């Protein structure tokens, strides 16, 4: 699974 702290600027729920 993706690491959401790889880039803190990315909101994974924003589509």
């Amino acid at each position, epitope marked *: 699974n993706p690491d959401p702290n*790889a880039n803190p600027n990315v909101d994974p729920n924003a589509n």
Partner: antibody
Amino acid sequence: VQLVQSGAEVKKPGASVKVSCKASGYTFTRYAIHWVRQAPGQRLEWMGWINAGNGNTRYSQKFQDRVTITRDTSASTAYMELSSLRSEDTAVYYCALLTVITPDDAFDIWGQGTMVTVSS
Amino acid sequence: DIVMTQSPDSLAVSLGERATINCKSSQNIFFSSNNKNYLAWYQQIPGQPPKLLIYWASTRESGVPDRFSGSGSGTDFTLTISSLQAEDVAVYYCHQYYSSPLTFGGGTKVEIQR
């Protein structure tokens, strides 16, 4: 939204360098500042990020022993300090708001880059 | 680390011809839970920092011309320029933000045959 970096520098092999990155056009504490370097002819190499608000960091394995990333919220500036420089560290150093993807906005902003040359 | 491998290293086609750049990730960058691929495409001209063109492997950044399009899922990705323009001469990089460290492809240089 802009990032403005300090000027190019020469440092001797073994010395340290500190590059600044002044942010404008947004609330500085909202996003993470990344540092990425680009050697002449080589690809982009990510070094680390700093949360401009709480100051937490994540460093790449290559640079952990010699990089320090800090920020000054009052001055809206992030800094990268690389120590024990080698010729292999001669490169353009960019600060960047990489892939800011939020619910209602998506953008990506880079500084102009700071050329650091390791040389006597 | 997630190696990003681009092919070809260089590309030359005529004005208005279609250009294809391939990017393969050393591991799968698709997340079934949100059906997203954690891939961006960048454009770099000499003297300037890279410019974001595509994110989530296929969402164009605002202002980017529609002749740029991203496709693929998992490990095999494509950046297509449907009709090359003279201003599109540049080096193109893919980028993954699935996991740490963040990584970039080796770049693909796009030239015009005239």
